[PDB]
UniProtKB/Swiss-Prot annotation, chain A:
Natural monellin has not been mass marketed to the food industry, primarily due to the challenge of large-scale purification of the protein which is relatively sensitive to heat or acid treatment. The record marks 41 as: Blocking, abolishes the sweet taste. Keywords: Taste-modifying protein. Taste-modifying protein; intensely sweet-tasting protein. It comes from Dioscoreophyllum cumminsii (Serendipity berry). Gene3D superfamilies: 6.10.140.2000. The lineage of its organism: Eukaryota, Viridiplantae, Streptophyta, Embryophyta, Tracheophyta. This is Monellin chain B. The keyword ATP-binding does not apply.
Length: 92, 91
């Protein structure tokens, strides 16, 4: 399964909040305040045709800094895990 | 304008080599050897009438992964390495 562009509406925004909420448990940057997920947002669907889960890559502004966050999502349960959180990075 | 994922092929391979060739002029990572373009490759089309394009690539060179952004001018066809960051983790 491949990567595709997705929009930055409510579902993506809540992915962003998840990422920042998970990074705040780790503490690597000190306490971040979620601002917004910006374009572009990418999803990889991991797989007759049957979806197992997804991988999201997002650019998340928090505390007015840009970070790159990768999130895995389970298709059946919608359990969610923060795989990576990099930055600050410049915009794509 | 819009971002899109594009297929990996000869075009991306040449952008990858360009990035590494340009970064080697800068010198920030020493002499890098091009290895591979890894998925995905993203392109943005910028409108003014087309003004130009912007590429984001994940480029393996000297067995380290870097993120490279390349701009391309529609009228001149000139290309520039805007940045080359890393090592970064895989997408």
């Amino acid at each position: 399964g491949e990567w595709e562009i997705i929009d930055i509406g409510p579902f993506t925004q809540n992915l962003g909040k998840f990422a920042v909420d998970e990074e705040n448990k780790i503490g690597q940057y000190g306490r971040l305040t979620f601002n917004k997920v910006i374009r572009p947002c990418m999803k990889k669907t991991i797989y007759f045709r049957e979806i197992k889960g997804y991988e999201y890559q997002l650019y998340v502004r928090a505390s007015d800094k840009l970070f790159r966050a990768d999130i895995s999502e389970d298709y059946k349960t919608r359990g969610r895990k923060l795989l990576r959180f990099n930055g600050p990075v410049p915009p794509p």
